[PDB]
Amino acid sequence: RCNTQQPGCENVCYDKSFPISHVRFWVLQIIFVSVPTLLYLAHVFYVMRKE
Amino acid sequence: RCNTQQPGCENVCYDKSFPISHVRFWVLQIIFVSVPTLLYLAHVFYVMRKE
Ligand SMILES: CC(C)CCC[C@@H](C)[C@H]1CC[C@H]2[C@@H]3CC=C4C[C@@H](OC(=O)CCC(=O)O)CC[C@]4(C)[C@H]3CC[C@]12C
Ligand SMILES: CC(C)CCC[C@@H](C)[C@H]1CC[C@H]2[C@@H]3CC=C4C[C@@H](OC(=O)CCC(=O)O)CC[C@]4(C)[C@H]3CC[C@]12C
Ligand SMILES: CCCCCCCCCCCCCC
Numbered sequence: 810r811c812n813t814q815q816p817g818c819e820n821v822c823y824d825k826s827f828p829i830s831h832v833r834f835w836v837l838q839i840i841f842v843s844v845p846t847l848l849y850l851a852h853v854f855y856v857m858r859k860e
Numbered sequence: 861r862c863n864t865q866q867p868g869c870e871n872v873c874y875d876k877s878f879p880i881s882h883v884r885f886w887v888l889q890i891i892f893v894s895v896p897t898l899l900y901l902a903h904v905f906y907v908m909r910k911e
């Protein structure tokens with residue numbers, strides 16, 4: 810909420826205050842931190858099949 | 861009118877903008893400009909009665 814009667818002010822002020830939400834930022838962080846292990850697991854699986 | 865949701869802001873802003881209304885200021889001005897002639901008329905009337 811904001812103290813004003815100007816239409817559209819709340820939208821822009823919220824957008825400026827929070828360019829991105831914390832929760833979605835953390836979701837991106839965890840996905841990025843997790844991808845390399847998945848890649849390594851897939852590589853090991855295929856190498857084991859070839860061996 | 862003012863652009864705000866704050867209660868009491870319109871009252872104080874109007875008071876600050878207009879310490880006194882123009883019309884009442886002009887009424888005071890004309891009364892002050894007119895009183896001396898009335899005083900002079902009364903003085904002349906009483907002097908004429910005495911004479
Ligand atoms: C936590 C670990 C120790 C056990 C749980 C994960 C495993 C079951 C993972 C490791 C590597 C994964 C594999 C790596 C790559 C592929 C991609 C994918 O390949 C495809 O068939 C894609 C479709 C296509 O080939 O057209 C199918 C799943 C599979 C076999 C994965 C199945 C799940 C595996 C075996
Ligand atoms: C524009 C001019 C040329 C004509 C129109 C105004 C006159 C009629 C004025 C001039 C002086 C005035 C007088 C000045 C003083 C007094 C005050 C007042 O005296 C009282 O009797 C007060 C009460 C009391 O004595 O206890 C009565 C009106 C009177 C006679 C005024 C009546 C009206 C007068 C005559
Ligand atoms: C929606 C609430 C958050 C749930 C966790 C986000 C998903 C986590 C995925 C795990 C990493 C996947 C690597 C590709």
Ligand SMILES: CCCCCCCCCCCCCC
Nearest residue numbers: 887890891892893894895898
């Ligand atoms: C209320 C609208 C304004 C009317 C004029 C104001 C009164 C003028 C009085 C005349 C002077 C009197 C001298 C004592």
